[PDB]
Amino acid sequence: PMFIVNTNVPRASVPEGFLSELTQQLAQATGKPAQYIAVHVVPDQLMTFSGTNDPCALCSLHSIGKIGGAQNRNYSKLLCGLLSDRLHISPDRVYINYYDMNAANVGWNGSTFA
Amino acid sequence: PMFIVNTNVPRASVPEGFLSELTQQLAQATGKPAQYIAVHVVPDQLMTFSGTNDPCALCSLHSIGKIGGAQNRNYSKLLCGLLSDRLHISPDRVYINYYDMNAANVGWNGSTFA
Amino acid sequence: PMFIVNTNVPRASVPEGFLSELTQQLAQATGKPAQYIAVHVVPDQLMTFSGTNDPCALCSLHSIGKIGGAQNRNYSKLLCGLLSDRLHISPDRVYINYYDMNAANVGWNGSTFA
Ligand SMILES: O=C([O-])/C(F)=C\c1ccc(O)cc1
Ligand SMILES: O=C([O-])/C(F)=C\c1ccc(O)cc1
Ligand SMILES: O=C([O-])/C(F)=C\c1ccc(O)cc1
């Protein structure tokens, strides 16, 4: 799976072990090995949410399976919790897009996952 | 909805209230109150379109509903007009990807929109 | 089509004609005219793969057509090849997401392809 976070929060505020933490947290939550988890954090972005430039985040979680109604609800609680505590972004100023990818549509190591 | 613009135009060429203008324009175009709109602009990018580095943009518009065939033509006219007028990007050097998102696949405020 | 590469490799490590090379290579692989190919490269990113900060890359290829199980395996070999040779990123530290876009959901030149 891969997780991307875009936020207007300055780089200086992103905690040092934040990416490794997200890796651990996601492994547990999706039940996928940490070896297949990729995390991408983009701070200092020029963004607005509800028309204001208060701290916000636009996130994306791509996974082959483990995506769905209940699972996504649990990912949102966990993820909003982490952004809130580590980056101090209010949970209602965060949008997370969930994508269930077909194995044939994910390339890796010179081939695909199918 | 959320709208993302990636462009090789420098940060300095992005007008001061442009994100607010985008927010207002999209609220009118989609019919969704500005309160539900997030905008993200990424300037200074390393990109080529048709093999050249003249000004260009790659955008994404995600919405829960309000997305579809004929309506996307309208969005393209509006959006390209704005980037042309404001950032001086030629319409033929702009791509916009449109995504209709399922509410169960959008996380917000600790849960999903489902 | 449009191709995006996000990497933690430094900007100075990206060879001069890389975007132009990707344009030709893509035109060749997909059969699409270079005129319609957009390339976006984002170096110096804060990202981890498998929990480590070693060179990695997260990419996306969007196309209207020319996307399929067999074609994607082919694109992946070519693309992981170029990234290893040119940016020295190990192929097992590269993800490429593939998207077959409906012509109606791709805006260009103030309209859509449908
Ligand atoms: O989640 C997975 O099964 C995985 F190991 C990798 C992955 C990479 C990119 C994606 O878009 C989704 C999954
Ligand atoms: O458009 C909507 O109804 C909305 F309130 C939020 C939203 C957030 C992220 C998306 O990707 C799409 C819609
Ligand atoms: O690939 C094509 O046929 C094309 F001319 C443009 C395009 C632009 C953006 C996309 O997301 C997909 C295709």
Q: Say if residues B7 and B89 touch (Cβ distance below 8 Å).
A: yes
CB contact under 8 A, A58 and B42: no
> What is the fold, at CATH topology level, of the domain defined by A1-114?
Macrophage Migration Inhibitory Factor (3.30.429)
- Note the ligand closest to the C-alpha atom of C32: 3
Q: Return d(Cα C72, Cα C98) in angstroms, integer.
A: 7
Residue A23, Cβ density class (10 Å: 0-12 exposed, 13-18 middle, ≥19 buried):
buried
- Residue that the structure tokens 């200092």 belong to: A44
Residue B58, Cβ density class (10 Å: 0-12 exposed, 13-18 middle, ≥19 buried):
buried
Cα C15 to Cα A83, B34, B37, C78: the distances in Å are 36, 42, 38, 18
CB contact under 8 A, A114 and C69: yes
Catalytic status, residue B1: yes
Query: Separation of A97 CA from ligand 2 center, angstroms?
Result: 9
Backbone φ and ψ for A12, nearest 5 degrees, come out as -55, -25
The closest residue, in CA terms, to atom 8 on ligand 1 is: A1
CB contact under 8 A, A72 and B20: no
Instruction: Please tell me whether C32 is known to bind a ligand.
Output: yes
Q: Say if residues B96 and A80 touch (Cβ distance below 8 Å).
A: no
Q: Return d(Cα C26, Cα C79) in angstroms, integer.
A: 9
C39-C41-C44 Cα angle (round to 5): 175
A79-A85-A90 Cα angle (round to 5): 75
Q: Return d(Cα B111, Cα A79) in angstroms, integer.
A: 10
Q: How many CB atoms lie within 10 A of CB B62?
A: 20
DSSP string of C21-34, one letter each residue: HHHHHHHHHH---G
Residue A93, Cβ density class (10 Å: 0-12 exposed, 13-18 middle, ≥19 buried):
buried
Q: Return d(Cα C39, Cα C55) in angstroms, integer.
A: 20
Q: Return d(Cα C24, Cα C73) in angstroms, integer.
A: 19
Closest Cα in chain A, distance from residue C8 (Å)? 9
Encoded tokens for B25: 């324009």
Cα B46 to Cα B33, B77, C19: the distances in Å are 33, 25, 9
Give the CA diameter of chain C.
43
> Looking at chain C, which residue has its C-alpha nearest residue B77?
C110
Binding residues of B for substrate, as ranges, are: 32, 64, 97
Chains that touch B (3 or more CB pairs under 8 A): A, C
B76 three-state secondary structure: helix
Give the rounded distance of the alpha carbon of A85 from its chain centre: 15
Q: Return d(Cα C4, Cα B96) in angstroms, integer.
A: 14
